[PDB]
Symmetry: C3
Subunit: 191 residues, 3 copies
Amino acid sequence: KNKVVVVTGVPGVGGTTLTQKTIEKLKEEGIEYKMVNFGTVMFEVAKEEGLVEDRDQMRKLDPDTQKRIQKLAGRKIAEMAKESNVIVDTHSTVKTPKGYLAGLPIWVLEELNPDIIVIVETSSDEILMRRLGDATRNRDIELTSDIDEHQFMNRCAAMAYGVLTGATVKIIKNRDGLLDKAVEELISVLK
Amino acid sequence: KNKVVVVTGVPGVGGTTLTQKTIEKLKEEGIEYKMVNFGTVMFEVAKEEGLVEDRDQMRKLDPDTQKRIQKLAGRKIAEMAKESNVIVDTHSTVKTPKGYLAGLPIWVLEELNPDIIVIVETSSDEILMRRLGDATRNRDIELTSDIDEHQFMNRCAAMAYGVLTGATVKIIKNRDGLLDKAVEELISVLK
Amino acid sequence: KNKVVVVTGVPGVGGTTLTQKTIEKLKEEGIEYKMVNFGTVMFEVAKEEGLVEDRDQMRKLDPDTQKRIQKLAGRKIAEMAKESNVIVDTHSTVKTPKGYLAGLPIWVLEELNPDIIVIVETSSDEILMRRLGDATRNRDIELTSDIDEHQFMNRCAAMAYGVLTGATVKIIKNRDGLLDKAVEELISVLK
Ligand SMILES: Nc1ncnc2c1ncn2[C@@H]1O[C@H](COP(=O)(O)OP(=O)(O)OP(=O)(O)OP(=O)(O)OP(=O)(O)OC[C@H]2O[C@@H](n3cnc4c(N)ncnc43)[C@H](O)[C@@H]2O)[C@@H](O)[C@H]1O
Ligand SMILES: Nc1ncnc2c1ncn2[C@@H]1O[C@H](COP(=O)(O)OP(=O)(O)OP(=O)(O)OP(=O)(O)OP(=O)(O)OC[C@H]2O[C@@H](n3cnc4c(N)ncnc43)[C@H](O)[C@@H]2O)[C@@H](O)[C@H]1O
Ligand SMILES: Nc1ncnc2c1ncn2[C@@H]1O[C@H](COP(=O)(O)OP(=O)(O)OP(=O)(O)OP(=O)(O)OP(=O)(O)OC[C@H]2O[C@@H](n3cnc4c(N)ncnc43)[C@H](O)[C@@H]2O)[C@@H](O)[C@H]1O
């Protein structure tokens, strides 16, 4: 009871838009999912402690501070899952200056116990271009091969999640012009 | 003392053929291995319970129902390894509608405790062409890149197995026209 | 109690050279790190027992005779960390005739508990070319696609390490002619 779905992707791949369009379309049939953004759970604890003005400052903090707030947020979100189904928008790995940080390290992974881990992907081309069109959230404008490296290490981390807990790992394409098709696939997956 | 070899590969890549041709050539030098097909252990429990007419319907079931039969099948096979050496024909990950499912999740992995995990690969081209040549076992006719996606994730899970158990992870190419050469590589490995 | 940074890389890629140039330049800033070569600690226990004349003869021994000595060496290196910061030069995976053998299987990984895992990369072209220039440490002259297979699996193993411990996984390019740039990035990471 109470399903826990994790939705992941490098910044710019659009996992948030996918989650939101799928949830509003799930509610047309009375399938209620609550969206939880893990970075927002984290960003409220950080903003309480003075470590960050905004949320793009979090992947740059010392990784032991990152892991400390990540663990809190996983506990908090696990509690949210006791009340309703949740789709958790978060990361297979977070890119930090000191490397990729697993977003669900085994202790956090065990606390959420997701049923399905979704990887939202597209070509690094389209990601870089989406990142450059948004002068709101200031994201890594990195080379496309750096983007591909991230999507590469996201697959690796995510599949280890599946080896550890038995969750299925679903890859869904969210390509420029075809968001609707990513929603049909994610919707179909949650039934 | 009871060696346990796990042989993996996407459908059509030819692990059953590699195993059968190797085991009979091993028996010419007096090295007895028994072939054990994980999907058949599962398919005997499923059909006993009414879940399936055939075995290509098994990757489509409830993944909670899969993992429950998966664990059983690992148990039956762990007992088989007490009596003889086994090459187990199975899957690093199984493609299911709700994503890739680890074939040796950590509870099944520790019950089998394989010494060597073999990965049989070829180009996504040659696999698809093999799938279309066979109206006996009806298989996933997917894009060649979905086939490449699968072989990518099979490598991730297998290296995770190797991190968890210390098993070596061996990649063998089983290429068209060169089945012969793939057997020589595997026979050599089992010494 | 002090830092443990692990530096990994296929033979020929320059992890040993990178480590050393970084260690002496850190000492310009009064930052003392002790270099430790995982292969040398093993070969101190190994030639002590007669299994190898030289160190290229370790990826060639039976995979249970290695793992028998791999655990010993991780313990020695844990002891050094109580005394000084250590950068451990070792391998994400070791290529043996029986496959890739994880360099930090979970029991060794748990004893070292590295804070950061560095993967040193460049193109297999440049790596292969370096292996041919050296008639001193005689190395695997394998195809560039075999070198790529290896760098793939090193990444798979490395990210799984990061899932089990929370160590960040940093990818650093050590490109022909630009060793210095691979040194400033690692220096920058260690502050
Ligand atoms: N597990 C964890 N561990 C540790 N720390 C963690 C953590 N999880 C989070 N954190 C911390 O929190 C921070 C970030 O959290 P977070 O706030 O989740 O996100 P982010 O990394 O900035 O990702 P975005 O939501 O901005 O990417 P999205 O692509 O999902 O956005 P959108 O759907 O709008 O869309 C992107 C753009 O594309 C557009 N778009 C989407 N799809 C399409 C399409 N198909 N065609 C055309 N345009 C499209 C949209 O309109 C939009 O313009 C991290 O840096 C980390 O520090
Ligand atoms: N761990 C686990 N967890 C959960 N579920 C599990 C599981 N393990 C199994 N299952 C379940 O069991 C089901 C499938 O089990 P299983 O029957 O093991 O898998 P499969 O999907 O049917 O794979 P195949 O056996 O059909 O292909 P193959 O690798 O044997 O190729 P083969 O050599 O036979 O022949 C293929 C063709 O290619 C040809 N071929 C092979 N090599 C060459 C070559 N060099 N040149 C030309 N042709 C070649 C052959 O001649 C032949 O025509 C799954 O759906 C799943 O539900
Ligand atoms: N966890 C573990 N578990 C089990 N066993 C383990 C283990 N860890 C280790 N072992 C065992 O120990 C054995 C050997 O391990 P180890 O002793 O690490 O030796 P190796 O792996 O053979 O690596 P090398 O030291 O020969 O390569 P390097 O790239 O590090 O050399 P250099 O940096 O000089 O660089 C090479 C050449 O490239 C050049 N170069 C470097 N950078 C550049 C550049 N940017 N441009 C041009 N040239 C460059 C140099 O000048 C030089 O000529 C293994 O077989 C294994 O059994």
